C-alpha cells in the first residue's frame, strides 16, 4: 500500500497545480470556442432526448445521496439536466477539501441520471457572495431556464415559494426572510439547506438590477428526508461507512461500495496539503493573497508551527467558512489581483467534465 498511497498523494498535487493554472489562464482568456461547442452538445442532447428545455443547479454531490437523485429526477421531467459541479481546487461551498474529486463526483451525477456535468467555479478561495454570483453566471451562460431544487418543508418555505412563484424574489437579513418587491416579512430564519435557494434568489435579483437579463424558474422538489451532507462524510472518514449506505442511492454505492470493499475508499478521501498552507503563511507576500487587514495580523503572528496556530492567529469572532477560506488561499497562492479577474471574467470556458 505505501506505493499506491504515495500515486494518490502525488496525483492529488499534480491535479491542484493543474487547477491552479487553469485558474490563472482563465483569468486572462475566455475560450469562445469552448462555448459553441457547448452549445452543439446540447443541441444534440436536447434532439435526442426530446427535450427542448435546459435545467441547471449547482451540485456539490459530496456525496450524491438519496435527496440529491431525487431531486435530479423531477428535474429532467422538465429537459434535460445540467449539473454544475465545482470545481478546480477541489475545495467546496464550506471552504474545505472535497469528499472526493470532481471526477469521481461526476461520475456520481451521470450514474444518478444528469446529461451533461460542467465544472463549477473554485468555491474555497471565494467569499459567498462570490460564489454565488459566479453560479448564476455561469447558468445564464449555459441558457438554464428552469431551476430545479431540493427543499426542506417549512412554514417559511411555503411564502418563499409563493413569493418566487409570483415572480418575486428573496432578500436575506439578519433574522428577516423578505419579498423584496413586496416588503412582506416572510418569517425568520430557514433551515440551512434552504438558504441556497434565498441566495439564488437575492442574486438574480441583483444581477438583474445590474443589467443581466436572467429570469429562470425554479422548479422547487419538496425533499423526503433530511438528510445531512457533512453527517455522512464525518461517518465515512470514521470508518462507518455501512452506517450511512441507506442515505445513499444504488447509483452512488455502485462507486462507493467497490472502493470500501477492497479497502480502497478511505485513502482517496482529499484533504488539505499542509506544507502548503505552513510555506505561504511563513514565506510569501501574504498581502499580494490575502486581505489586508489578515495580511497584517498573520505577517506579525508568523513563523507559524502548525495550521492550528494559522487558524487562532486570525481576526476572533470571525466565521468558520472565513477561516477555512483563508486556509484554502495560502494553500493554491492565487494572486488578489489575479482572483479578481477571473471573478470578473467568470465564466472564461465551459468545461465539460461527463456527458451521457
Do not use: W
Amino acid at each position: 500500500q505505501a506505493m499506491l498511497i504515495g500515486e494518490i498523494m502525488d496525483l492529488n498535487l499534480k491535479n491542484f497545480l493543474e487547477d491552479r493554472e487553469e485558474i490563472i489562464r482563465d483569468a486572462k482568456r475566455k475560450d469562445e470556442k469552448s462555448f459553441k461547442d457547448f452549445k452543439k452538445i446540447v443541441e444534440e442532447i436536447k434532439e435526442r432526448e426530446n427535450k427542448d428545455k435546459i435545467v441547471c443547479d449547482f451540485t456539490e454531490y459530496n456525496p450524491l445521496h438519496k435527496g440529491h437523485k431525487y431531486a435530479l429526477e423531477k428535474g429532467k421531467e422538465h429537459g434535460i439536466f445540467i449539473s454544475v459541479l465545482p470545481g478546480p481546487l477541489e475545495r467546496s461551498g464550506r471552504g474545505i477539501p472535497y469528499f472526493l474529486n470532481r471526477y469521481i463526483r461526476a461520475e456520481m451525477a451521470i450514474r444518478a441520471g444528469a446529461d451533461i456535468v460542467v465544472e463549477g467555479p473554485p468555491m474555497g478561495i471565494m467569499g459567498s457572495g462570490q460564489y454565488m454570483r459566479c453560479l448564476i453566471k455561469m447558468f445564464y451562460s449555459l441558457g438554464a431556464e428552469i431551476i430545479p431544487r431540493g427543499y426542506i418543508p417549512e412554514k417559511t418555505m411555503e411564502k418563499v415559494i409563493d413569493c418566487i412563484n409570483k415572480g418575486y424574489h428573496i432578500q436575506v437579513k439578519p433574522y428577516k426572510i423578505i419579498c423584496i418587491e413586496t416588503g412582506e416579512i416572510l418569517g425568520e430564519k430557514l433551515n440551512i439547506d434552504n438558504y441556497v435557494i434565498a441566495s439564488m434568489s437575492q442574486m438574480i435579483y441583483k444581477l438583474n438590477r445590474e443589467g443581466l437579463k436572467f429570469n429562470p424558474k425554479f422548479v422547487f422538489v419538496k425533499r423526503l428526508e433530511g438528510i445531512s451532507g457533512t453527517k455522512i462524510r464525518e461517518a465515512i472518514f470514521s470508518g462507518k461507512f455501512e452506517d450511512i449506505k441507506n442515505m445513499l442511492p444504488k447509483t452512488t454505492l455502485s462507486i462507493l461500495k467497490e472502493l470500501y470493499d477492497n479497502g480502497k475508499l478511505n485513502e482517496l478521501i482529499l484533504k488539505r496539503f499542509e506544507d502548503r498552507i505552513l510555506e505561504t503563511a511563513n514565506e510569501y507576500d501574504l498581502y499580494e493573497y490575502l486581505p489586508s487587514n489578515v495580511a497584517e495580523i498573520l505577517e506579525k503572528k508568523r513563523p507559524f508551527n502548525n495550521i492550528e496556530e494559522i487558524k487562532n492567529s486570525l481576526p476572533y469572532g470571525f466565521s468558520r467558512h472565513f477561516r477555512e477560506r483563508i486556509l484554502s488561499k495560502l494553500e493554491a497562492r492565487i494572486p488578489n489581483e489575479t482572483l479578481s479577474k477571473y471573478i470578473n471574467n467568470y465564466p472564461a470556458k465551459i468545461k465539460i467534465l461527463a456527458v451521457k
